[PDB]
Design a protein around this ligand. Structure first.
Ligand code: 1SY
Ligand code: 1SY
Ligand code: ZN
Ligand code: ZN
Lengths: 346, 347
């Protein structure tokens, strides 16, 4: 039961050296790209975010870009996507991407993509290739040595206050404090050239890393033997549940629209519903994991999974995931839950 | 006469080491399960209650589970079955077995059973197997070494006042005192996932049944010295044994298979209420005391009425539970055995 989950966690720990070595490779590439990018006038002042691992051998890196004070205009009533313009009119090196007053996502995403392709080639160090993951992605993906993939995402940084669609987001007040929510909302936010064109959408993955690492009601959660909670183990288990299922439905790829981010997002909502560290005692691993699985289910059947930061933005909208894929994954997860997770067997 | 019953008690003493070893096996198994269960979030706080030996090779164990303050709602007008809900609306790990406000018996019984099934298999200690006894049973039954069976019953514990259906039950005042009944009624009561409707639980008072059996005299020192040896325990043994011997003689059509030692125990407690003095149970008067027990059991069969000692409006001999034929059949055999100095105790 709970002893089964621990066996899965032990199993996952085995490929910890294998995912570190892959990461060593990813770092070298990133740093190299980071230097050439600074030689471009538009991209000097580029840097690495978080000051990484979605799945085994799938890596995620963000390139922050310090940008002059930004005027945001909300596209349609999509609560996440925005037109970008400047609030100065002496002109700056991003003017080659302006169209009117609007900063072109796609034009900047196109040169960003171009510079990387340029650096890929003269590299005789290794075999790296460009590939496009899916339309829409603000990420440029690389394949390192035909086994490791890296999502490299361009990100504009805005130090001004978070937009109004985030007002009721980040409901961490009863879990982490109200004052932590204030401290976090003083931090920058990011805009990535994901269109849904000339649109950018909000990204808060730096806060995501932060609430994951600093995750307890107690400031000393997981800093001593008396406060070992199972939040991280539960997210590990959720991600792994999804990946196993995605592989078992490899024939017709019914589940290929779901990702670790849906899982991570739902896990954050569960932390909000269960704000006490006593609710994540490692002795209750089986039950805590069950709490995460039941909430993910309710999300699938209700077809509603709200962005943690942007509550009116539903990640499970029919516009993103078809109604059939959701009903299908509900059936699967329901079954696995009703039978003590056969996908975690042997 | 009285010597024939004594011979039977002596014969039964011969298999005292044989059932003690079997009980030793049962304990080891139960204690093993008790630890694995405490690793589960919903079942930590589980323990052993204390009734142990229903039959010569049938064992009965209860697993108590401390539960926060319990709201009961009586199902239909059944005086024994109840819905279980919490008076909390912070919630405890039984929250995964909820449906609305109601605590599901079947949902909790199914994880209990499922946890047990898991420990049984990887056990290389012996051949232990799962079996379901009968429809309705709140028990998970095990078979040890293909000879010994153990009823393991989950039981919620409530430290609140006994429900109203019990108000006229436990009529022990003239036998054990009015003050003993007050003491016992301050003790917890239990709910077992015996369903009527798979979300119901019914009441259990077997801990109280043990207490009045062991502590059974009007005199506090009954059976603590040579001057006070009563035959209460002996009469219940003979009664159980009578039922078991008969159930074996009708091995053919299984005519008596609705009856169990619990009816006999239930009926013996009524006879105690009727004979409250230790002098009505002198060991010299064994044949006569034993007759009192058999006539009353007959009257119950013939009147088709055997009320639960704790819940008087709950009739165990109702046509709803045992058919009218089976009762009339057992009345015949018992009438015959009583009329002929109990031939089933011969040789
Ligand atoms: N590496 C990377 N960083 C991103 O920010 C991101 N956003 C999208 N994608 C990938 O682009 C494609 C377009 O999907 P879309 O945007 O419509 O919905 C996305 C997106 O709205 C949301 N999502 C993913 N990452 C983030 C994120 N960091 N912040 C907010 N939302 C996100 O959850 C959906 C599923 O994402 P993925 O299935 O894991 O991959 C997507 C997809 O392949 C991303 N890939
Ligand atoms: N180990 C165990 N503990 C129980 O509480 C219990 N309750 C029922 N059963 C078994 O489930 C089945 C359903 O019988 P039912 O409920 O209709 O009538 C039962 C029930 O009304 C009552 N009875 C037996 N044990 C108890 C008990 N501990 N408390 C109250 N009543 C009981 O007398 C009848 C005959 O019981 P059994 O024929 O020996 O075993 C029963 C039966 O196999 C039990 N088995
Ligand atoms: Zn912690
Ligand atoms: Zn006595």
């Amino acid at each position: 039961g709970a002893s089964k989950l621990r066996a899965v966690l032990e199993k996952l720990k085995l490929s910890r050296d294998d995912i570190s070595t892959a990461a060593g490779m990813v770092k070298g590439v990133v740093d190299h790209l980071l230097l050439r990018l600074k030689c471009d006038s538009a991209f000097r002042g580029v840097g690495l975010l978080n000051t990484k691992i979605s799945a085994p051998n799938e890596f995620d890196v963000m390139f922050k870009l310090e940008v002059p004070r930004i005027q945001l205009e909300e596209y349609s009533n999509t609560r996440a996507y925005y037109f970008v313009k400047f609030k100065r009119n002496k002109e700056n090196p991003l003017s080659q991407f302006l169209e009117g007053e609007i900063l072109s996502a796609s034009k900047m995403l196109s040169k960003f993509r171009k510079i990387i392709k340029e650096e890929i080639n003269d590299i005789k160090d290794t075999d790296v290739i460009m590939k496009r993951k899916r339309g829409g992605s603000p990420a440029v993906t690389l394949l390192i040595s035909e086994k490791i993939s890296v999502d490299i995402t361009l990100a504009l940084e805005s130090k001004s206050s978070w937009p109004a669609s985030t007002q009721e987001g980040l409901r961490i007040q009863n879990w982490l404090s109200a004052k932590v929510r204030k401290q976090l909302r003083l931090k920058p936010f990011y805009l990535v050239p994901k269109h849904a064109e000339e649109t950018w959408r909000l990204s808060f993955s730096h806060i995501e890393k932060e609430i994951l690492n600093n995750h307890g009601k107690s400031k000393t959660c997981c800093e001593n033997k008396e406060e070992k909670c199972c939040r991280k183990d539960c997210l590990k288990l959720m991600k792994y549940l999804l990946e196993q299922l995605k592989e078992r439905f490899k024939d017709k790829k019914h589940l290929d629209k779901f990702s670790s981010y849906h899982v991570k997002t739902a896990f954050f909502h569960v932390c909000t519903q269960n704000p006490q560290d006593s609710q994540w005692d490692r002795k209750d691993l089986g039950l805590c994991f069950d709490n995460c699985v039941t909430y993910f289910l309710q999300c699938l059947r209700t077809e509603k999974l709200e962005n943690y930061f942007i509550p009116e933005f539903n990640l499970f909208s029919s516009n993103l995931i078809d109604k059939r894929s959701k009903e299908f994954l509900t059936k699967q997860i329901e079954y696995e839950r009703n039978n003590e997770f056969p996908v975690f067997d042997e």
